[PDB]
Symmetry: D2
Amino acid sequence: STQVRGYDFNRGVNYRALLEAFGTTGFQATNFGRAVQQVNAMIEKKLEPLSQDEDQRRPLTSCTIFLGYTSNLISSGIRETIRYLVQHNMVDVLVTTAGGVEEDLIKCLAPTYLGEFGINRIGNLLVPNENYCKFEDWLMPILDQMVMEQNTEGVKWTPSKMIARLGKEINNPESVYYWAQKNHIPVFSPALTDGSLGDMIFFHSYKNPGLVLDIVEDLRLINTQAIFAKCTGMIILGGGVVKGADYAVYINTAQEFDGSQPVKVYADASLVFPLLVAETFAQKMDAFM
Amino acid sequence: STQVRGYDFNRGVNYRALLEAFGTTGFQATNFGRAVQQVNAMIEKKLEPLSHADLTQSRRPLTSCTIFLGYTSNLISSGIRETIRYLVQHNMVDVLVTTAGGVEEDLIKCLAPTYLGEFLRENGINRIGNLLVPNENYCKFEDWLMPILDQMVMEQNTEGVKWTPSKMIARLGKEINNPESVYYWAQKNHIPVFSPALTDGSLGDMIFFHSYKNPGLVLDIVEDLRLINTQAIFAKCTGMIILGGGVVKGADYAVYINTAQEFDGQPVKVYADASLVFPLLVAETFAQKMDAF
Amino acid sequence: STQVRGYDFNRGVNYRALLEAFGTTGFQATNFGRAVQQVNAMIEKKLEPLSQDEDQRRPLTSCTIFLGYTSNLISSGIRETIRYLVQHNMVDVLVTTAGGVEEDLIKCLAPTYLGEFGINRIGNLLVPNENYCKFEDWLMPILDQMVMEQNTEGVKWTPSKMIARLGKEINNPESVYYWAQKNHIPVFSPALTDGSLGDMIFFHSYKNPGLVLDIVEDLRLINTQAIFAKCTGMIILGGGVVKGADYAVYINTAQEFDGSQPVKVYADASLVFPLLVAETFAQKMDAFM
Amino acid sequence: STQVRGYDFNRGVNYRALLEAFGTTGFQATNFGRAVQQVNAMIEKKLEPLSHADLTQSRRPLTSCTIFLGYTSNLISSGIRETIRYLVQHNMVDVLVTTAGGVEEDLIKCLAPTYLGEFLRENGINRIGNLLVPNENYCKFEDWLMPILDQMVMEQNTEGVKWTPSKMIARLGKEINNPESVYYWAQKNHIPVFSPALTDGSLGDMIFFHSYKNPGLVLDIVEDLRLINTQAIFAKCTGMIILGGGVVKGADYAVYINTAQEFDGQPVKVYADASLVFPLLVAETFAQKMDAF
Ligand SMILES: CC(C)C[C@H](CN)N1CCc2c(-c3cccnc3)csc2C1=O
Ligand SMILES: CC(C)C[C@H](CN)N1CCc2c(-c3cccnc3)csc2C1=O
Ligand SMILES: CC(C)C[C@H](CN)N1CCc2c(-c3cccnc3)csc2C1=O
Ligand SMILES: CC(C)C[C@H](CN)N1CCc2c(-c3cccnc3)csc2C1=O
């Protein structure tokens, strides 16, 4: 067995040794260590070529990695972390919750600010209401195009296809969804219209009615990704995002007690996720380039 | 300024008095008291006489307060399913909103029971906290569901039905035809149910597999988006009672009951397991006014 | 096995049936049900006469019940709940944390108020600073008497003996510690001087030095209570209070994940404890009178 | 107003830059950044030159900032024991405060290791979260401890020593005589340790049993009360770093790191497991200034 032992700062500030020593530190530090091993196993599996027997828009690899996250993390600076992974094709499918799309898009038009625990407060973050007004103006012409394409070109819209379209339109390398569509990484979000984006789609529908967003074609798409995977890796940030995974890491502060080798790290992902990425995907950056 | 004071058991045990004294006990007990006041205000507003079905596209008549009841699926797996069913049965709320699993966990309880365990896969058991759902429950549900999905596809392609999650949930409640079901009562009383995440869990798995045996089902969320937002927009007053987190995204009255934290990102929040608190809340509010409904 | 089933309000508001139905409701409601059974088992054991073989200031019963609680609950209205139990000899030993003594005593001099989440805020409670000034005035002459008794009568003070003395002095039936000393229920609290009471003892010690509070005699006293018990019941509210129990109920919101048939109810005790007492000790009130 | 922005890994991996970017990431990452600023301010104040041992009754010289380091015993069972030991070893803090178990869990690690398990009684194992302490560790500690307690009683009754928890902790650290021990370094560097709850756990069990074999030990808390309060009162400036809850009851700088909640009842709180956060905090603060100490 492994002895409990924390990093000894008499050795100086050796950051890599420090991060490795979380594994033997105990409690959630140990879980962070296990999360690093689990994600490195997904990456190692993913970079392993498909054998001649295992062969199949996005090409299949030896490990399909699903990255899920709640909207709050897209409001946070973890948006940059997720965008980096998507940009370099390190994950294959994104899943998110109400708000998780528009909050990325809105940051390309106006910044989010730090406050404290016309303003939309999200934890200690501040989104001025003018951000959402700018977003409305940008969005409306796109929605007119989408309804026209539905009615005159037989386009059958789903949340994922809509998200891809919004990513193409924002046309900005800081956007998670710009990179997702450019790299053919599908984004699933049945709760896409539950928040502000949904409010705008709602008002738009009275000037220009009939937009259909089907979730059943998306249901087929996401499940086929899971079913045809050689191996599956899950990285889920925050709770309430998804409902067998060969590798899995969950990072959230949800409790089990009210009913709400897989690894759970009980921590705010805003602290843990960048450290996790530093020791995993960022070490194998060239292999993905 | 109210003094802190707890119920004195030298009075004996009067449960009404015990529950009222939560108000002056402090911490979440006080929030519970504030939640009772807030829900009672909703009810009183709902009951006071009103002195556009085209705009709402709904058959349910407007009252002076539209109450939205939101809840996570785990609460339906629990006995809070009975609490919710009762409110729905007697038309005490106007709109339901739930999360992935929140529909099928109710319907499956009509076919077979959920059991109490403790805080599995080789025996075929889906654990939800200290609750146990045998996998055979889901198999029974699947068999029940398939022919209904067949009818739904046929009605869509030949009777022009445009399905959405809410219309599906209504159909499933009518089909289950069982007075213990939330969704049976909801459709009977024209209380719509919204759940964009309807297909994220087991029910979705079954719909997915069904779609290869019988392709064609479309579930539109935009028509539901209009229905739920028109309910809010054309309300005279709105009340919100939301159990667990992540259900909904101005409300004149609002009560939230959950144990989610604020730190990783007058409305009343009670920081508590709704399985304890919600039946106490119902007892001191809706259940006191049963006659008026 | 037991089927999950919540209370059905079509039966009307039958409070006792409602409380019983928590047992089959699931999650923490089920734990509340288990807590009720566990505490009723302690009480039943306690009211059972000592057999002729089992015989021993406080007389031993068939079950010694330890009631522990954090200071915050004494600031809350749960102070009334605890006081009721102590008043009628339903528990045998109290254990508490820093502040848990003085907050009871101070309420006999001035009230605590409700605020929101010169004022000492405790959660959503408010203690005006003038409360602590009144307490200081009341306390100083008592501390002079205590030092005199130590030096001229050989009194060897410990936290428990001090707490008993303060309870006798407050001489008020609303006080937990008045009833504890009257009924010979010892109160243990090594952290007695960590807060405001300690601040006053500290300043007092420069006008009138030499007060000794020994924790070792208390160590012996509390452990002997545990060792000589026929049966032991633990009821612990909040975390960090104590460190084999035949019956045990813990009510707190502490998590396991950072390392901080016994039953744990994960809930604010301000909600749960009065309901627990209603269905347990309060049902057997006459047997204790 | 600072814009929300996370570390961009297109820069590659610079750990200093990564940790600085926590400040602008939001939620607890931002609090971490604020914690680094706050601790760095303490250190800078401590290091700036000072231009009453009678009143404190202490041998440790005053600096321009007295830093109190508080921590719960579970952190000593973890590897954070090493982090704390390092700070104590290099005199970077002035006063330690801990909770029941916080002394013996350090001393026992000098006799035998704590192991990693997972989140027992028949094998003889005390589980602390995902940590495992074999019961034999406590037996070894007991045997080591008894003759020291004998000496302590004799010194009390014949050399007039007036024992308190802090003086006991110092004696135990001197006896363990091992540079991996927090308490060894604390006594060597005249950093006092306060723990009124010293006897609530295993160490107390042993003291209790010892007291029948060799009666007479007195542990006074009032003399410790004076010592700790005089440290605070005669500080030029005070800094507080408190890990886990329930340790202490004006501070010029204060950082708290724990996962306790406010709901059942500029200082910086980081809502996080200190096993993750504290080594990162130390890396960006005290460990950057090692030379100055
Ligand atoms: C972990 C994944 C690979 C599998 C599970 C299977 N129950 N699954 C699939 C369906 C689904 C959706 C969904 C539904 C409809 C449209 N778009 C998105 C969102 S989360 C989720 C989900 O968990
Ligand atoms: C609190 C309500 C009255 C208003 C808010 C407005 N942002 N709103 C409406 C849209 C919506 C949905 C939705 C979306 C699409 C289909 N079906 C359901 C689920 S929750 C939610 C939600 O919060
Ligand atoms: C559960 C009880 C019956 C047993 C445990 C045994 N480790 N125990 C006893 C010692 C003790 C104290 C203590 C210490 C010194 C003076 N006064 C109070 C406070 S809590 C506690 C504690 O948990
Ligand atoms: C934050 C400090 C500098 C000040 C506060 C003042 N209320 N204070 C001092 C007394 C004290 C103890 C104490 C008590 C007796 C013996 N030994 C230790 C433990 S924590 C604590 C505590 O918070």
